[PDB]
């Protein structure tokens with residue numbers, strides 16, 4: 001026999017939809033002895049900038065609790081079928097669901113609490129454990145560290161700027177670069193919903209014994225595969241799935257500059273075993289690729305030349321500036337950070353997206369900022 005209790009839970013929160021919206025909360029409560037209660041409710045707004053999930057019946061005892069914001073409808077059901085905390089947090093979410101209209105998927109860490117029988121248990125309603133009263137319903141705060149923080153399950157990638165410079169080599173002067181398009185390649189399109197620790201890794205491994213492969217990478221544009229297969233190259237392997245949200249045309253009125261792209265974690269950039277001609281710095285790490293028209297003046301020429309529709313590809317987070325003036329190598333793409341990429345174009349790009357021609361002719365500076 002198991003005793004009954006009630007649970008109400010408050011989360012910390014930061015009308016056009018925004019990347020901080022919390023529309024729904026899915027709560028998984030897993031007793032240490034094997035019982036589980038999982039439910040989804042609309043998040044109720046609160047005057048203090050927190051949001052609540054109203055009392056729900058659960059069982060008494062020690063339990064592990066995790067909160068997911070903005071789970072897609074089908075994910076809500078998958079989560080409700082979890083039998084244990086590991087299957088819950090390992091639930092696979094899909095990138096194509098991550099819109100400001102849904103709200104971005106976010107999760108808490110796994111909480112450990114003791115639920116008291118025959119009473120209202122609160123999580124997140126006070127900064128200390130103990131008996132409290134909320135709207136005349138007395139009960140007990142069982143977590144005691146303020147409202148439960150949520151961490152986004154996506155990262156934000158944007159091109160902050162793209163201008164010209166000259167190479168030391170100096171066969172020529174750069175004259176201009178006009179941006180036409182920005183897109184993302186090798187975006188992991190799947191992720192775990194939550195991590196055990198706060199802001200922990202939720203990245204899905206690809207290939208090996210997993211069932212994720214090339215179609216689970218997402219890409220903003222597709223290219224011709226015949227006669228010259230240009231949809232693949234040293235920079236990008238596999239037939240990846242097109243997702244229109246991962247490309248943006250640059251037009252004066254609706255710019256590609258500062259447009260944010262949302263992606264899941266990718267630090268491993270796995271390719272299939274046995275692939276040829278793999279540049280491991282690019283394939284299949286998430287890339288930001290720009291296309292535009294580059295104009296230069298050759299040494300001693302009367303006039304300049306414009307190469308139209310040149311590409312420049314960047315592996316996102318190979319080297320980052322973080323905490324203002326610190327540096328990290330191999331940071332790649334991690335959850336709940338904003339990546340601001342500034343490009344210095346120093347020569348003509350490639351006519352094709354996934355291989356260079358002679359030299360990359362681009363230098364990139366990537367700032368990473370925690371998100372909001």
Ligand SMILES: [Cl-]
Pocket residue numbers: 247248249
């Ligand atoms: Cl567009």
